Amino acid sequence: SEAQSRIQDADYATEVSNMSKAQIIQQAGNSVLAKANQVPQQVLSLLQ
Amino acid sequence: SEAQSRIQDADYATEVSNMSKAQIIQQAGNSVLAKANQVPQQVLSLLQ
C-alpha cells in the first residue's frame, strides 16, 4: 500500500500551486486579449 | 507433582507485568493512531 501510494496519489502541496498559476495566467491572458482587441480602431479616428 | 508444576503453572508477577505493559502499549497506540489520523486535514486549509 505504501508503494502504491507513491504512484497513484497526487501532491496537494503542488496542485493548488499549479492551479493558482494557471488561473493567474488565464486572467492575464483575458486582460491582454481585451486590451489588444480594440487596436484596429485607431484607423477609425485616423481616417476621419 | 512439584516437578510438573514447574512446567505447567505460570508466574503471576511476570504475567501482570506483561499485562500492564501490553495495556500501556495499546493505549499509546490508540492515542498515536487518533493523533496521526488528522494529518491530511492541512491540505483542506491549503486548498482554500
Side-chain angles (χ1 to χ4, degrees):
Chain A
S1 44
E2 185 194 285
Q4 188 188 223
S5 60
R6 311 178 194 257
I7 312 179
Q8 272 180 343
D9 312 328
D11 209 6
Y12 268 86
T14 71
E15 289 301 332
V16 187
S17 300
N18 294 25
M19 171 196 64
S20 43
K21 287 168 49 182
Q23 207 163 357
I24 291 177
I25 292 175
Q26 179 188 220
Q27 292 162 304
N30 278 332
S31 44
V32 172
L33 173 62
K35 69 169 53 178
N37 218 32
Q38 78 307 340
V39 199
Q41 59 181 7
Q42 277 74 2
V43 166
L44 300 184
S45 84
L46 188 150
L47 59 89
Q48 59 91 17
Chain B
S1 171
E2 81 174 11
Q4 165 195 329
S5 186
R6 292 163 175 173
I7 315 181
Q8 280 185 344
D9 302 78
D11 205 359
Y12 275 100
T14 62
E15 287 307 318
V16 191
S17 314
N18 291 130
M19 188 210 75
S20 44
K21 288 173 57 180
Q23 288 181 350
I24 293 176
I25 290 178
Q26 165 170 345
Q27 298 184 57
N30 279 339
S31 45
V32 170
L33 165 65
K35 200 151 46 186
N37 202 0
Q38 60 268 14
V39 174
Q41 287 197 206
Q42 272 92 21
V43 309
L44 192 148
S45 69
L46 192 137
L47 58 86
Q48 65 94 16

